[PDB]
Amino acid sequence: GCTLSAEDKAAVERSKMIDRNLREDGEKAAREVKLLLLGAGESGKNTIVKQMKGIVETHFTFKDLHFKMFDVGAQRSERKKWIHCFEGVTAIIFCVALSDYDLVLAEDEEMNRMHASMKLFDSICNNKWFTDTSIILFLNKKDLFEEKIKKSPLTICYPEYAGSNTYEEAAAYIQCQFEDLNKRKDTKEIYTHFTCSTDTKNVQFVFDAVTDVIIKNNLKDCGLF
Amino acid sequence: TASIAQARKLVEQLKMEANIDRIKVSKAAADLMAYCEAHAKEDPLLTPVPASENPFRE
Amino acid sequence: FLEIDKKNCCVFRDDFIVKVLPPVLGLEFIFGLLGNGLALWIFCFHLKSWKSSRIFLFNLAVADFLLIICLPFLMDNYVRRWDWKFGDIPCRLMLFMLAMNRQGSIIFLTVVAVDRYFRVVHPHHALNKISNRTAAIISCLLWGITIGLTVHLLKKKMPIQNGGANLCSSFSICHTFQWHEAMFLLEFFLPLGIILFCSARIIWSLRQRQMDRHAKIKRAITFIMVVAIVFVICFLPSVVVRIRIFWLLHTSGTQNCEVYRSVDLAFFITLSFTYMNSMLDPVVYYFSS
Amino acid sequence: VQLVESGGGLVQPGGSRKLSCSASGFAFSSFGMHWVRQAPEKGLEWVAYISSGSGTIYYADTVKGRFTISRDDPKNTLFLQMTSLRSEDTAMYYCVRSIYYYGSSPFDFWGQGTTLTVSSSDIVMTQATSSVPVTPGESVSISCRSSKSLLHSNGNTYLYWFLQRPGQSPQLLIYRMSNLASGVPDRFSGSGSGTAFTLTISRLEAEDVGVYYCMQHLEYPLTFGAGTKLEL
Amino acid sequence: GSELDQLRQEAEQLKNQIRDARKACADATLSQITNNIDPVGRIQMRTRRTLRGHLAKIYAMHWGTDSRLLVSASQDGKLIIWDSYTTNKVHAIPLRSSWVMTCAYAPSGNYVACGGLDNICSIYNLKTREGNVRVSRELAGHTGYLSCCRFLDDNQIVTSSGDTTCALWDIETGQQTTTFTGHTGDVMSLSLAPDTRLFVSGACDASAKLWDVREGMCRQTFTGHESDINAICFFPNGNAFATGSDDATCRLFDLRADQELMTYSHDNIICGITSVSFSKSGRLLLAGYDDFNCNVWDALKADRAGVLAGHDNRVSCLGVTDDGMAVATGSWDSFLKIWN
Ligand SMILES: CC(C)(Cc1nc(-c2ccc(O)cn2)no1)C(=O)NC1=C(C(=O)O)CCCC1
Fold this sequence. Notes:
The structure holds five protein chains of five kinds.
Chain A: H1 6-28, E1 32-39, H2 45-52, E2 56-61, E3 66-71, E4 91-97, H3 113-125, E5 134-140, H4 143-150, H5 167-179, E6 190-194, H6 202-222
Parallel strand pairs in A: 1-3, 1-4, 4-5, 5-6
Antiparallel strand pairs in A: 2-3
Chain B: H1 2-16, H2 25-38
Chain D: E1 2-6, E2 9-11, E3 14-24, E4 32-38, E5 44-50, E6 57-59, E7 67-72, E8 77-84, E9 91-98, E10 114-118, E11 125-126, E12 131-133, E13 140-146, E14 159-164, E15 171-175, E16 179-180, E17 188-193, E18 196-201, E19 211-216, E20 228-231
Parallel strand pairs in D: 2-10, 12-20
Antiparallel strand pairs in D: 1-3, 3-8, 4-5, 4-9, 5-6, 7-8, 9-10, 11-13, 13-18, 14-15, 14-19, 15-16, 17-18, 19-20
The structure holds ligand FI7.
């Protein structure tokens, strides 16, 4: 104070105003929810994105809460070098359309799309940067699945399965074989939901899941945990 | 012929990275060491600059 | 037994105080001192988090570590049968450190509950993201009320000397309304209501949303009932006895104080349950969570 | 960039008047503002300072409690308010912008100011010479002095040189007694030491004639010298 | 068929020939020559300044030319220009894409460059007339994430991307005048020579390449690391460079005799390197590991001479001044620190 010229004091003042603007900016960034979106391709990722409304971004609001979706479909790069940038997100949203077992991807006629989706979900679910991160599993395009299943039992992709080939037992079995992939079971929860392309709920579901995650985080902040 | 053309481009690059001169390792080590010795006075962090001439003094 | 302070009082310095109270209080001293000292050591050097809820808990520890070091002089007061041989200056310090570090245990015990009522029933509320600079403004603006209510017991010639040798005490039977008895009644009746309301809604909201299936979300509900069970045990006895004191004092006057001989023996027992609370809080709140 | 200033005129000695400059073409809300006053056929004198964020305010010792500066960032407009006007308040007023950070160049743009007429310790800087005759094509030198050392301990030397060509407003020429402002040729230079300094010009040109001024900025108040004219 | 087989074979014995030719030029080792000189003592350096104000992870910092200013980049969405002496805040610049991986400071002091995970490189103008910092250029054209950027002069810039390509750009022109192709894996870093004539780049295929700005050609290819390459930089003399990798190892490569010079690794370290930098005389090498702390090794003897242990998370960026006055470290705990 006593050693500073008349020009140094103005510089200190400028630095202080910059400090206050940084602090005010960084607080509004903590009233928004981060959701990272993944899928196996045309697994209904695009259709859920159009349902809710380089690296792609999306923003939406619903009952006074701000959600951000970070779509990384087109990056096509080595995923291990850019995945930790999302280490602190709220949730992951993973899309797979459940009528896509008979129709195989162009890459292979034998290895089906369901096996690739299983590989993707298994690889994401045990990532070292997501040990405390919840996952919302959407299962898409359900109406077509009965038409595809009645022509051939699930034995094509589920040969070790036995069932009368109704929608309920088939879809339920698919969901089981999906949620059994988790390896945490104590610091992670998986929320599964069956839906068609069109919907009137895919938005409430994510609201509920993130409300649960937030309340648990709060109770952990208490130490009541 | 596209595959053999790509192999042709790769072997061209191989041709033109085998047309360079080589020196010894001892000479390069000596050069590095000599440059290090000759500048052992203008660097504050190596030879601790006395606290009377440093603008980061606490 | 009658005696004359500024008022008409009938203290009963009697026996059986001398043979039980000091051994009771020694263990409470050596355990409360230890527990709150370790809690303070944890929060001073080994807690880098420093978020808004661990600074509403450090203050509880500093408030109920102070009403522990206040004990040994009381053991020496009781051992030698009500002789206050430490002069006038400590008869302000000690009678201020008792009446301040007890209300300040209750106050910081009753914020660590309203804090959770919001972290569960009303989450995403702005109050859940207050800074730890706007919280150590009300963790210092709350010591203000305690001090500003316990000052007017420093400006008195407190050591009362008569035929009885130097009682240092302001709890005594009388007939004049001392509004520092209402500050006993209120200080127990309001925090209990708040704590019960908060814990009730916490538990009833944490199952209407069906979170009531996870293994480690039950230990929290049990630990929310544990703290509220040890708040009636430690305090209600000494309260109801004092309602009985006023009941007798209104049914009959301060004429033949023989009546009170038994009940005043009870108070200085039921008061020792209040010193209990300061030595099992570093567990129910600090390690067992 | 421009600072169009208005508010002047003729005033009875007992009265109030306001002077407002409107800033267009830059980020006005990051710039400390000053008022600097010049008297008819005399030198000039500093008036007042208001910084970025309305934190620090400074007045000249002769204007204390009778002038009032004010700022408006939502519309980029700055005012000065006067209530007591003795006969020695007839002058013109130039509002200057400046910005302070490491490497900045304060007193960079100057504006045009307005003319107000009225019905009829401190460091000292003096320019002994009043006019140096010269013909184009050779060196010219002007010298200024201070009452003490202006080299602050941090390393700077808050001495400024700046020019007023006949019939217009000033513009910075040298800031911190060694550095050359943006937009002026390398014909100019400035040297000095301790308390004695010299502005210098190598090649004279028909645009180089003017009245030259020195200022210090070490502490408050800001103090000028006299006006050193050049003639062809 | 036969043509494909014979051409792949020919590529193979040419690779064998190049390997044999770099083996045939070695007759000594660096350590044998250098073990005699007296070692520098314990490098006791204390935090003389602590810059705080970022609210998230920090990835990039770059020193100014005068050795008094510097710039830094974090996920908050901010670039910051600092005053190292008075700990003031000179400039604070917003960004459009929060996901940034690199920034650089112009050798004159008029511009800065930022980019990452968006396939763009943005150029901002510091010394403007208007008083603010504004975006001057949006270089576009890569198909991966941008990993590094460096200014050549006030008009030329060189970028490396995750789509396995490097490129040279002309800021006024707005288009690539040279593309450098040949990396299999993603390219993660690059460094410019002292005289701006050649630059090295290191990639995810455990190799680095030397490039000719004028010729746009891969003159040398360097191998030897077991895993990815995270950071690279030249020696100040301009005839060597230092590589930091993801297998808990640092390495030195020569240019004239393109071999392995020295390896810096300790068994107690099993984590990854994020940055390297050199001393004013090139006697000390600073490496930022993600075991939360920085290491100061002898860039000449492959020993350990000091530790900078003042950070509580991953050490991402690191830098040294043009005169040697200080070093600066950033980290994922959002704190910058100056050591003297
Ligand atoms: C001073 C006190 C506590 C009675 C008292 N306290 C207040 C008061 C009023 C308002 C308020 O907010 C807080 N305190 N008014 O009277 C008292 O006689 N205490 C005694 C003991 C004890 O309390 O442990 C041990 C044995 C000797 C008697």
